[PDB]
mmCIF file of C-alpha atoms and ligand atoms in Angstrom:
data_model
loop_
_atom_site.group_PDB
_atom_site.id
_atom_site.type_symbol
_atom_site.label_atom_id
_atom_site.label_comp_id
_atom_site.label_asym_id
_atom_site.label_seq_id
_atom_site.Cartn_x
_atom_site.Cartn_y
_atom_site.Cartn_z
ATOM 1 C CA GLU A 1 -0.102 -0.170 0.024
ATOM 2 C CA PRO A 2 1.583 3.222 -1.290
ATOM 3 C CA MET A 3 -1.263 5.533 -0.726
ATOM 4 C CA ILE A 4 -0.927 9.391 -0.714
ATOM 5 C CA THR A 5 -1.944 10.835 2.586
ATOM 6 C CA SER A 6 -0.804 14.418 2.017
ATOM 7 C CA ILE A 7 0.628 17.042 -0.496
ATOM 8 C CA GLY A 8 3.465 19.442 0.165
ATOM 9 C CA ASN A 9 3.987 23.163 -0.560
ATOM 10 C CA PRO A 10 3.878 23.952 -4.138
ATOM 11 C CA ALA A 11 6.858 25.427 -5.835
ATOM 12 C CA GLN A 12 6.351 28.015 -8.762
ATOM 13 C CA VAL A 13 8.266 27.252 -11.848
ATOM 14 C CA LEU A 14 7.068 29.812 -14.179
ATOM 15 C CA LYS A 15 4.299 32.459 -14.832
ATOM 16 C CA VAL A 16 2.864 32.503 -18.421
ATOM 17 C CA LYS A 17 0.227 34.450 -20.198
ATOM 18 C CA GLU A 18 -2.326 31.677 -21.105
ATOM 19 C CA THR A 19 -5.039 30.665 -18.311
ATOM 20 C CA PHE A 20 -5.125 27.058 -19.775
ATOM 21 C CA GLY A 21 -2.406 24.808 -20.808
ATOM 22 C CA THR A 22 -0.368 21.886 -20.107
ATOM 23 C CA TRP A 23 3.456 21.092 -19.275
ATOM 24 C CA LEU A 24 4.649 17.779 -19.510
ATOM 25 C CA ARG A 25 7.913 15.717 -18.937
ATOM 26 C CA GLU A 26 9.010 12.202 -19.698
ATOM 27 C CA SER A 27 8.635 9.642 -16.945
ATOM 28 C CA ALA A 28 9.889 6.331 -18.806
ATOM 29 C CA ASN A 29 13.456 7.183 -18.086
ATOM 30 C CA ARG A 30 15.713 9.557 -16.257
ATOM 31 C CA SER A 31 17.890 10.703 -19.479
ATOM 32 C CA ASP A 32 15.360 12.950 -20.834
ATOM 33 C CA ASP A 33 15.226 16.665 -19.753
ATOM 34 C CA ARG A 34 12.688 17.924 -22.337
ATOM 35 C CA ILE A 35 9.532 19.659 -21.483
ATOM 36 C CA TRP A 36 6.578 20.088 -23.769
ATOM 37 C CA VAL A 37 3.978 22.814 -23.608
ATOM 38 C CA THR A 38 0.441 23.270 -25.054
ATOM 39 C CA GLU A 39 -1.432 26.612 -24.791
ATOM 40 C CA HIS A 40 -5.073 26.915 -24.296
ATOM 41 C CA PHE A 41 -7.745 24.113 -24.519
ATOM 42 C CA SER A 42 -7.774 23.716 -28.277
ATOM 43 C CA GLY A 43 -4.991 23.831 -30.865
ATOM 44 C CA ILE A 44 -2.538 22.156 -32.995
ATOM 45 C CA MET A 45 1.053 23.069 -32.049
ATOM 46 C CA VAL A 46 3.194 21.790 -29.129
ATOM 47 C CA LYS A 47 6.143 23.896 -27.763
ATOM 48 C CA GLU A 48 9.366 21.693 -27.095
ATOM 49 C CA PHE A 49 12.018 22.777 -24.528
ATOM 50 C CA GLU A 50 15.503 21.301 -24.298
ATOM 51 C CA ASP A 51 15.512 21.428 -20.701
ATOM 52 C CA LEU A 52 14.354 23.623 -17.746
ATOM 53 C CA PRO A 53 16.616 26.784 -18.589
ATOM 54 C CA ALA A 54 15.042 26.813 -22.169
ATOM 55 C CA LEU A 55 11.521 26.851 -20.511
ATOM 56 C CA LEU A 56 12.494 29.733 -18.231
ATOM 57 C CA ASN A 57 13.815 31.687 -21.181
ATOM 58 C CA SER A 58 10.951 30.977 -23.608
ATOM 59 C CA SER A 59 13.285 29.169 -26.001
ATOM 60 C CA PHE A 60 11.208 26.535 -27.872
ATOM 61 C CA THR A 61 10.801 24.804 -31.024
ATOM 62 C CA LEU A 62 7.440 24.121 -32.493
ATOM 63 C CA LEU A 63 6.028 20.762 -33.190
ATOM 64 C CA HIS A 64 2.990 20.648 -35.514
ATOM 65 C CA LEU A 65 0.522 17.782 -34.616
ATOM 66 C CA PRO A 66 -1.345 15.812 -37.238
ATOM 67 C CA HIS A 67 -4.680 16.604 -35.467
ATOM 68 C CA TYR A 68 -5.916 19.451 -33.213
ATOM 69 C CA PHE A 69 -5.919 18.714 -29.604
ATOM 70 C CA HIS A 70 -8.909 19.420 -27.258
ATOM 71 C CA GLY A 71 -8.346 19.847 -23.472
ATOM 72 C CA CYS A 72 -5.516 19.917 -21.072
ATOM 73 C CA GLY A 73 -5.285 16.271 -20.248
ATOM 74 C CA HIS A 74 -2.448 15.040 -22.308
ATOM 75 C CA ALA A 75 0.375 12.914 -21.368
ATOM 76 C CA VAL A 76 3.853 12.078 -22.440
ATOM 77 C CA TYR A 77 5.348 8.572 -22.122
ATOM 78 C CA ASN A 78 8.211 6.750 -23.818
ATOM 79 C CA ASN A 79 8.965 9.465 -26.225
ATOM 80 C CA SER A 80 5.186 9.574 -27.266
ATOM 81 C CA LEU A 81 2.432 12.346 -26.738
ATOM 82 C CA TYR A 82 -0.916 11.056 -26.098
ATOM 83 C CA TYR A 83 -3.629 13.485 -26.627
ATOM 84 C CA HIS A 84 -7.608 13.873 -27.336
ATOM 85 C CA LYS A 85 -8.446 14.469 -31.086
ATOM 86 C CA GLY A 86 -10.655 17.384 -30.839
ATOM 87 C CA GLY A 87 -14.206 16.626 -32.243
ATOM 88 C CA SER A 88 -13.912 12.898 -31.937
ATOM 89 C CA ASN A 89 -13.901 10.080 -29.488
ATOM 90 C CA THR A 90 -10.226 9.358 -30.656
ATOM 91 C CA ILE A 91 -6.993 9.349 -28.550
ATOM 92 C CA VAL A 92 -3.972 10.065 -30.747
ATOM 93 C CA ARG A 93 -0.530 8.756 -29.920
ATOM 94 C CA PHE A 94 2.256 10.922 -31.752
ATOM 95 C CA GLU A 95 5.608 9.716 -31.571
ATOM 96 C CA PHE A 96 8.218 12.385 -31.405
ATOM 97 C CA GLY A 97 11.071 12.789 -33.803
ATOM 98 C CA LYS A 98 9.549 10.476 -36.331
ATOM 99 C CA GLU A 99 6.434 12.567 -36.006
ATOM 100 C CA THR A 100 3.782 10.087 -36.886
ATOM 101 C CA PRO A 101 0.393 9.218 -35.281
ATOM 102 C CA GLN A 102 -1.493 5.909 -33.972
ATOM 103 C CA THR A 103 -5.179 6.153 -32.745
ATOM 104 C CA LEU A 104 -7.455 4.519 -30.475
ATOM 105 C CA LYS A 105 -11.401 5.069 -30.232
ATOM 106 C CA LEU A 106 -13.272 5.105 -26.809
ATOM 107 C CA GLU A 107 -16.718 4.381 -28.078
ATOM 108 C CA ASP A 108 -18.682 4.889 -24.902
ATOM 109 C CA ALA A 109 -16.919 8.287 -23.989
ATOM 110 C CA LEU A 110 -18.394 11.717 -23.809
ATOM 111 C CA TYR A 111 -16.093 13.772 -26.280
ATOM 112 C CA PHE A 112 -17.898 17.151 -27.513
ATOM 113 C CA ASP A 113 -20.644 19.839 -26.994
ATOM 114 C CA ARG A 114 -19.104 20.719 -23.561
ATOM 115 C CA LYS A 115 -20.100 17.312 -21.929
ATOM 116 C CA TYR A 116 -16.755 17.553 -20.195
ATOM 117 C CA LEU A 117 -15.032 14.881 -17.934
ATOM 118 C CA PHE A 118 -13.596 18.042 -16.012
ATOM 119 C CA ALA A 119 -15.577 21.175 -16.878
ATOM 120 C CA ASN A 120 -13.135 23.374 -14.848
ATOM 121 C CA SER A 121 -10.439 22.679 -17.310
ATOM 122 C CA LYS A 122 -12.559 22.084 -20.598
ATOM 123 C CA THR A 123 -11.188 18.542 -20.754
ATOM 124 C CA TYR A 124 -12.935 15.391 -22.028
ATOM 125 C CA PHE A 125 -9.892 12.767 -21.702
ATOM 126 C CA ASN A 126 -7.230 12.665 -19.084
ATOM 127 C CA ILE A 127 -4.320 10.423 -19.980
ATOM 128 C CA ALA A 128 -2.013 9.317 -17.208
ATOM 129 C CA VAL A 129 0.866 7.145 -16.664
ATOM 130 C CA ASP A 130 2.269 5.602 -13.377
ATOM 131 C CA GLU A 131 3.862 2.806 -11.746
ATOM 132 C CA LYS A 132 0.998 0.545 -12.279
ATOM 133 C CA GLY A 133 -0.279 1.298 -15.956
ATOM 134 C CA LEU A 134 -1.071 3.545 -18.769
ATOM 135 C CA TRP A 135 -4.574 5.040 -18.048
ATOM 136 C CA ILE A 136 -7.413 7.059 -19.738
ATOM 137 C CA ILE A 137 -9.827 8.787 -17.697
ATOM 138 C CA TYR A 138 -12.986 9.667 -19.228
ATOM 139 C CA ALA A 139 -16.784 10.046 -18.728
ATOM 140 C CA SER A 140 -19.662 7.629 -19.802
ATOM 141 C CA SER A 141 -21.710 8.536 -22.879
ATOM 142 C CA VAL A 142 -24.096 5.644 -21.507
ATOM 143 C CA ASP A 143 -25.363 7.261 -18.263
ATOM 144 C CA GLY A 144 -23.941 10.735 -19.002
ATOM 145 C CA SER A 145 -22.089 10.865 -15.646
ATOM 146 C CA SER A 146 -19.941 8.007 -14.493
ATOM 147 C CA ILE A 147 -16.132 8.312 -14.520
ATOM 148 C CA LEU A 148 -14.459 5.457 -16.091
ATOM 149 C CA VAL A 149 -10.850 4.692 -16.557
ATOM 150 C CA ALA A 150 -9.382 2.638 -19.460
ATOM 151 C CA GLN A 151 -6.298 0.650 -18.626
ATOM 152 C CA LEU A 152 -4.034 0.429 -21.803
ATOM 153 C CA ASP A 153 -1.277 -2.021 -22.826
ATOM 154 C CA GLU A 154 1.437 0.611 -23.793
ATOM 155 C CA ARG A 155 3.123 -1.790 -26.290
ATOM 156 C CA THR A 156 0.167 -2.128 -28.378
ATOM 157 C CA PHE A 157 -1.824 0.948 -27.669
ATOM 158 C CA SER A 158 -4.973 -1.195 -26.918
ATOM 159 C CA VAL A 159 -7.379 -1.186 -24.109
ATOM 160 C CA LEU A 160 -7.051 -4.190 -21.621
ATOM 161 C CA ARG A 161 -10.324 -2.996 -19.474
ATOM 162 C CA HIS A 162 -12.619 -0.253 -18.721
ATOM 163 C CA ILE A 163 -13.036 0.370 -15.074
ATOM 164 C CA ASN A 164 -16.312 1.907 -13.637
ATOM 165 C CA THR A 165 -15.271 4.245 -10.649
ATOM 166 C CA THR A 166 -19.141 4.868 -10.170
ATOM 167 C CA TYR A 167 -18.128 8.482 -9.282
ATOM 168 C CA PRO A 168 -20.098 11.099 -11.031
ATOM 169 C CA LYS A 169 -18.315 13.814 -13.027
ATOM 170 C CA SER A 170 -20.284 16.412 -11.585
ATOM 171 C CA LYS A 171 -18.393 15.966 -8.216
ATOM 172 C CA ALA A 172 -15.174 16.119 -9.944
ATOM 173 C CA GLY A 173 -12.792 19.029 -10.250
ATOM 174 C CA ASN A 174 -9.888 17.221 -11.808
ATOM 175 C CA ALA A 175 -7.706 13.963 -10.877
ATOM 176 C CA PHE A 176 -4.573 12.252 -11.139
ATOM 177 C CA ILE A 177 -3.146 8.679 -10.729
ATOM 178 C CA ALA A 178 -0.555 7.424 -8.637
ATOM 179 C CA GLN A 179 0.547 3.915 -7.797
ATOM 180 C CA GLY A 180 -2.585 2.394 -9.340
ATOM 181 C CA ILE A 181 -4.989 4.709 -7.238
ATOM 182 C CA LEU A 182 -7.038 7.362 -8.892
ATOM 183 C CA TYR A 183 -7.418 10.505 -6.710
ATOM 184 C CA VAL A 184 -10.176 13.230 -7.754
ATOM 185 C CA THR A 185 -10.440 16.637 -6.437
ATOM 186 C CA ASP A 186 -13.669 18.367 -5.358
ATOM 187 C CA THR A 187 -15.364 20.917 -7.707
ATOM 188 C CA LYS A 188 -13.306 23.873 -6.618
ATOM 189 C CA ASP A 189 -9.963 21.994 -6.968
ATOM 190 C CA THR A 190 -8.795 22.620 -3.411
ATOM 191 C CA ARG A 191 -8.774 19.097 -1.900
ATOM 192 C CA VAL A 192 -8.638 15.517 -2.928
ATOM 193 C CA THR A 193 -11.686 14.067 -1.606
ATOM 194 C CA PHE A 194 -12.296 10.621 -3.586
ATOM 195 C CA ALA A 195 -10.118 8.008 -4.298
ATOM 196 C CA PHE A 196 -10.487 4.551 -6.156
ATOM 197 C CA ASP A 197 -8.146 1.485 -6.231
ATOM 198 C CA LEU A 198 -8.053 0.721 -9.896
ATOM 199 C CA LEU A 199 -6.529 -2.608 -9.689
ATOM 200 C CA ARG A 200 -8.891 -3.933 -6.950
ATOM 201 C CA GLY A 201 -11.778 -1.871 -8.494
ATOM 202 C CA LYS A 202 -13.030 -0.315 -5.001
ATOM 203 C CA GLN A 203 -13.278 3.117 -3.548
ATOM 204 C CA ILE A 204 -10.842 3.831 -0.773
ATOM 205 C CA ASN A 205 -10.827 6.504 1.979
ATOM 206 C CA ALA A 206 -8.877 9.795 0.964
ATOM 207 C CA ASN A 207 -9.227 13.349 1.944
ATOM 208 C CA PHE A 208 -6.497 15.673 1.840
ATOM 209 C CA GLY A 209 -5.547 19.255 0.970
ATOM 210 C CA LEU A 210 -4.017 20.065 -2.378
ATOM 211 C CA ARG A 211 -4.052 24.073 -2.296
ATOM 212 C CA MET A 212 -5.652 26.975 -0.982
ATOM 213 C CA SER A 213 -5.707 28.993 -4.384
ATOM 214 C CA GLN A 214 -8.935 28.772 -6.124
ATOM 215 C CA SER A 215 -7.648 30.181 -9.382
ATOM 216 C CA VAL A 216 -8.666 27.977 -12.374
ATOM 217 C CA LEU A 217 -6.722 24.672 -12.414
ATOM 218 C CA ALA A 218 -6.041 23.753 -16.092
ATOM 219 C CA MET A 219 -4.014 20.580 -15.666
ATOM 220 C CA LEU A 220 -3.101 18.267 -12.796
ATOM 221 C CA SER A 221 -0.755 15.367 -13.451
ATOM 222 C CA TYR A 222 1.405 13.032 -11.448
ATOM 223 C CA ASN A 223 4.938 12.207 -12.666
ATOM 224 C CA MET A 224 6.435 8.991 -11.210
ATOM 225 C CA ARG A 225 9.892 9.785 -12.156
ATOM 226 C CA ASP A 226 10.026 12.395 -9.732
ATOM 227 C CA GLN A 227 6.723 11.626 -7.576
ATOM 228 C CA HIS A 228 5.522 15.411 -8.034
ATOM 229 C CA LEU A 229 2.314 16.843 -9.159
ATOM 230 C CA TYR A 230 2.764 18.973 -11.978
ATOM 231 C CA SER A 231 -0.233 21.610 -12.468
ATOM 232 C CA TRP A 232 -1.113 24.743 -14.672
ATOM 233 C CA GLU A 233 -3.040 27.093 -12.635
ATOM 234 C CA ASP A 234 -4.162 30.205 -14.240
ATOM 235 C CA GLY A 235 -0.868 30.700 -16.149
ATOM 236 C CA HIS A 236 1.412 29.523 -13.399
ATOM 237 C CA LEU A 237 3.332 26.322 -13.654
ATOM 238 C CA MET A 238 3.511 24.634 -10.305
ATOM 239 C CA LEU A 239 5.166 21.700 -8.650
ATOM 240 C CA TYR A 240 3.953 19.805 -5.561
ATOM 241 C CA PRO A 241 5.783 17.180 -3.551
ATOM 242 C CA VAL A 242 3.670 14.092 -2.492
ATOM 243 C CA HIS A 243 3.731 12.130 0.692
ATOM 244 C CA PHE A 244 2.896 8.351 0.704
ATOM 245 C CA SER A 245 1.989 6.582 3.879
HETATM 246 NA NA1 NA B 301 -5.546 15.690 -14.361
#
């Protein structure tokens, strides 16, 4: 049982102009220092930064995606960007350098017309990677409400199972996944108030503070390589230490 019981004080990395965005780092290995950024909740470009100093100096190169993204729920893993293809129920896996895409359809997912998984961050899909798997958080188009998590096989970009948390998206601000546990924030994105053991398929007790700010939270992501939460909060890129008990 590695379960998170508290979150440390955040560190501010950088202030930027756009209210919504993502910032992403690799977690498959410890040799890649690149940082990727998307701005806004709709677009087709990604900014790539060589390392933290390049990020701090706004020194980026531009990557052109094969399809527009929606939302702020993307993830990077093993030199690939996973993102929601805007206007569809399709997830794109875009491999860097070779700059070519693969796709996965989630047939029973909400995906347009503001039927968001996380309304606060205009997000329909949240891809997450941790110590226990590659995951896609989404909301059911069948009941219109339930948060589901697809567990993927990374090597084949295919779905192994669809897990029903039974938790209604209207109660969720945002979420992240660590050591195989889904942690979901309240609607004001100040506390984690729900958790779900994805491997055992059951709710588990969790309630702990995340932050005091109530500025808009655009992105919230756990990185297993450094065991920090990464966030984008109204243009502030932040890092939070995590404490496991
Ligand atoms: Na998230």
